[PDB]
Design a protein around this ligand. Structure first.
Ligand SMILES: *[C@@H]1O[C@H](CO)[C@@H](O[C@@H]2O[C@H](CO)[C@@H](O[C@@H]3O[C@H](CO)[C@@H](O)[C@H](O)[C@@H]3O)[C@H](O)[C@H]2NC(C)=O)[C@H](O)[C@H]1NC(C)=O
Ligand SMILES: *[C@@H]1O[C@H](CO)[C@@H](O[C@@H]2O[C@H](CO)[C@@H](O[C@@H]3O[C@H](CO)[C@@H](O)[C@H](O)[C@@H]3O)[C@H](O)[C@H]2NC(C)=O)[C@H](O)[C@H]1NC(C)=O
Ligand SMILES: *[C@@H]1O[C@H](CO)[C@@H](O)[C@H](O)[C@H]1NC(C)=O
Ligand SMILES: [Ca+2]
Ligand SMILES: [Ca+2]
Ligand SMILES: [Zn+2]
Ligand SMILES: [Zn+2]
Ligand SMILES: [Zn+2]
Ligand SMILES: [Zn+2]
Lengths: 528, 529
């Protein structure tokens, strides 16, 4: 006989609770995409027309919009419960608020298993986190059993805040143990569900004996068979058919990010649990699919709370925060210094092997700073509304691995048309740059010194052209914005981080009073 | 028909709850002083043998030791209630934790009136908190009535945290209004009790018609008639007899600080409320006075509660905090940068007229940095144990008004003996200094730039030699320590600030994780080792 299973899947939704623009920002109202209300409609229609359906999430529901800033995962619990997900693997961002912020609210209130086979808890954490996170789950689907093994990127201690009591083991090694276990228990249909990126997903498909399907995330990979429907370009067919070492074709799927698509894969197994066929395509959640009215009403109710929250005092500034174009696009601006200082602070993580932290530096282009904050306007009170005026686009600050020569090329771009009022000029933290604008464009960087990481006391050292560095930068620049083609990231050198206004808001909340100065992080030499 | 009144008084006790050393630090030796238990004994003995007694405090019970850091004024409430103070005037340090930290615990739980006549509220929160404070109180003493008018220094908004909605008015102007009110209400005996310093106390005695006695504080002034009993040097007789405008002698008293002395003034009034005699002397609270057992027992329990404060994690460092002599006495050290950043942060108020803050700069000599903190030692966890190793002396960071030329002279002193390993080298916040150590001692400063205050965005500007600046500095340097005679403070240019470990601990707790860098705050021209 055969057994047809429909796998619906999401990954890297990243707090897009409401429908979004085409590019996963704020929707204006005419052409909108995604959101949980529209996903609910499509999920319900498929469940009504398809016999055997699993709905899986491959991680990174946490982090991305003010929904996550305020509800802190309560929004994930709520709508993943109401949509009746069958399983979720943990992603790196589920650790952003530490283990306490993962335990409460997500682990204690979801109605479906949370899976990650390659996490090992230590210390007082041990006892029950072992009960809230499972390596795998056997799920009854019709008259059959389907085993789902979870996994989470080994990069999590560097990307997030899992703490000292969590070790992240090799995905292939750990998945192979639980695949053998499932097989020994008689389960012949095994899904690997996890959050380590497309390259690792294909390694799992290739090397883990007994894995039939891999459902991944982390790299926002878009796969599509045929001509795709929106502006995402396919990295390969859907599903991506990876040849295993033992000769089977193993379908690998991911479904981009931000809830724009619902993954949709039809897998036919024979009676021995071997995949005979796997076909489908991610469903674009566009305007043709109605927003479920009951979900929409819950979103609306919760939005009024979010609007009240956005007007609350986070902290105060006792200085003018000069985010005017005349400052941040022409010279050192104290608001840019504050932003990149906040970004560095948010990325302080468990320092391994001879570094006080894995990253010491941040850049933000003046064109990304969209407003000043006037301390005279309202007693210097900073709310999320003021921060949204400065950073209105809902982007993130990401981590980029970059050679010294490329970073120097970026600082030449920073001033190659200085004076024109365009947005290139880089505001910085952990960098000292000296320019000579009297030289020809492309030869204006006099010197670059950076905070060492491989040292016990941070101190400024000359940039080395052949050394590789980590730098924090806005997602806009990591996409090549403002002509920064050399800062464009890919899966091999780039990691997507936290919401910009959440980063800045958290820092202001901690400082209570802010007073950033112009301190000479960039210097314009008078030349000869 | 005379009326004899005994005035017992304290001022600037500054959180010396337990008995202290002779210099008002930790008592380790055989000779201890002060403390509330010893004060209680003497107050009780005087009340038992003297007929008409008032016990007054002229402010600044708040701030000075970890007792205040932990109990946050509950220790003031507890023992001032237990010792049965009759009135207290607010000092600048009672605003250290803001109006909320004054309301709770002090204003809501004292059993005696809190006085300050020259405060004027401007908003609803600052209004209902002032509703707990009175300009004056009439107190029944025997068969007589004594009016007490409070006052608080006008520098409180720069020295402490009252916020922008509490304004401090002129003392003489406001006190004359309430003296006139008391007079019309039939009160002919008036004490001015307040916290503005000895110079202002004498001005009040001289100019406010109807004031009979002034009980002051803020300047830690020691007065004594005859040979004094300890090492404090008297600035004048006790009481100081100030000639008033109307031709009478008005006794002016203060009682040093830190609870070492109990003020003791016997005043005789005639039947019209005129002082016809005033005499006494502050009582040294030394070993000859026993510590009250009940207060001593409560102190001993609170010492045990304080252990929580001393062993709790304040925050963590993820970098080595290099407080070794080899760093902080020879070059920029990241721990010195953190200390002075903490000090500036503690002295932030609100944009006042034309400046974003009244002070932007801090200095600390490397010799005041007494230990590193090793981030490898215990996962970088910082407690009071580690901070006390860095700052073991219980001093403060103070505010000094200084001319640009004098500040530059201090930076020449900073390197006049560089390389010999003594403690002069200045670590800084809000200053960029460049030195050339190959030049002769006294001519090594290449340039000095400082963060402007008179600006909307702080930025570095050249130091101006004839301009007057504010700088934060250790009490050790304000006493001329390490040869810094030009940083010596006096009443006209210097204000004592908060406990050093309280400043640094507060900043570390706020930051949570600290990671100070060497960032080039000082630069040595590239021509020496
Ligand atoms: C925020 O930053 C902008 C950009 O720096 C500031 O505007 C600029 O302010 C400078 C002075 O700080 C002006 O330069 C001076 O202009 C005067 C003429 O009034 C001239 O006499 C001087 O020689 C000097 O060149 C500059 O013109 C001005 N630019 C613009 C476009 O307004 C702004 O002041 C900052 N905001 C705050 C609140 O500090
Ligand atoms: C805290 O600060 C002190 C003082 O700067 C640091 O000690 C000094 O560290 C430097 C750099 O390692 C040493 O210079 C180097 O010494 C090595 C070791 O022999 C030698 O190969 C080179 O000639 C080079 O000059 C310097 O000797 C040393 N000074 C002393 C008095 O020990 C210290 O490293 C800092 N602590 C931390 C944890 O960073
Ligand atoms: C908005 O938030 C404030 C503070 O959290 C709260 O006092 C207020 O009731 C909230 N508004 C509503 C409509 O609940
Ligand atoms: Ca199988
Ligand atoms: Ca009188
Ligand atoms: Zn993601
Ligand atoms: Zn991820
Ligand atoms: Zn005082
Ligand atoms: Zn005072």
């Amino acid at each position: 006989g055969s057994f047809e299973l429909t796998i619906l899947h999401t990954n890297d939704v990243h707090a897009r609770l409401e429908q979004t623009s085409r590019d996963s920002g704020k929707c204006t109202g005419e052409d909108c995409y995604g959101g949980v209300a529209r996903r609910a409609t499509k999920i319900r229609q498929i469940r009504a027309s398809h016999r055997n359906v699993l709905l899986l999430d491959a991680g990174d529901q946490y982090q991305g919009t003010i929904w996550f800033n305020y509800y802190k995962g309560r929004e994930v619990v709520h709508f993943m419960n109401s949509l009746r997900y069958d399983a979720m693997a943990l992603g790196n961002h589920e650790f952003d608020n530490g283990l306490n912020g993962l335990l409460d609210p997500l682990l204690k209130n979801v109605k479906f298993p949370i899976l990650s086979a390659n996490i090992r808890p230590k210390g007082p954490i041990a006892s029950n986190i072992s009960g809230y996170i499972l390596p795998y789950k056997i799920i009854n689907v019709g008259s059959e059993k389907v085993g789902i093994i979870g996994y989470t990127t080994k990069e999590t201690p560097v990307l997030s805040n899992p703490g000292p009591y969590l070790e992240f083991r090799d995905e292939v090694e750990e998945l192979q143990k639980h695949a053998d276990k499932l097989t020994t228990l008689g389960v012949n249909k095994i899904i690997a569900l996890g959050h380590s990126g497309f390259m690792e997903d294909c390694r799992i498909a290739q090397k883990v004996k007994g894995v039939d399907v891999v459902v991944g995330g982390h790299t926002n990979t878009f796969l599509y068979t045929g001509s795709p429907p929106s502006n995402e370009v396919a990295a390969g067919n859907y599903p991506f058919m990876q040849l295993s070492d033992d000769g089977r074709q193993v379908p690998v799927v991911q479904a981009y990010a931000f809830g724009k698509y619902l993954g949709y894969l039809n897998v036919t197994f024979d009676d021995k649990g071997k995949v005979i066929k796997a076909s489908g395509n991610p469903i674009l959640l566009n305007k043709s699919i109605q927003e479920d009215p009951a979900v929409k009403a819950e979103i609306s109710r919760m939005k009024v709370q979010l609007q009240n929250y956005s007007s609350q005092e986070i902290g105060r500034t006792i200085v003018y925060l000069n985010g005017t174009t005349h400052a941040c696009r022409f010279h050192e601006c104290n608001l840019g210094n504050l932003i990149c200082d906040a970004v560095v602070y948010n990325n302080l993580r468990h320092p391994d092997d001879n570094e006080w932290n894995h990253v010491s530096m941040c850049i933000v282009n003046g064109g990304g700073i969209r407003s000043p904050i006037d301390e005279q306007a309202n007693n210097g009170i900073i709310t999320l509304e003021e921060l949204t005026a400065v950073l209105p686009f809902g982007g993130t600050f990401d981590l980029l691995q970059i050679k010294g020569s490329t970073l120097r090329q970026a600082f030449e771009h920073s001033v190659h048309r200085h004076g024109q009022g365009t947005g290139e000029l880089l505001q910085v933290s952990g960098i000292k740059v000296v320019y000579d604008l009297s030289q020809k464009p492309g030869k204006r960087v006099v010197s670059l010194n950076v905070l060492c990481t491989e040292c016990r006391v941070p101190t400024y050292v000359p940039l080395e052209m052949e050394k590789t560095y980590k730098v924090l930068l806005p997602s806009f620049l990591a996409a090549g914005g403002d002509g920064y083609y050399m800062l464009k990231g890919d899966s091999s050198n780039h990691s997507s981080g936290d919401l910009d206004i959440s980063i800045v808001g958290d820092y202001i909340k901690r400082m209570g009073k802010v007073f950033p100065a112009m301190e000479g992080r960039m210097v314009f030499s008078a030349g000869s």
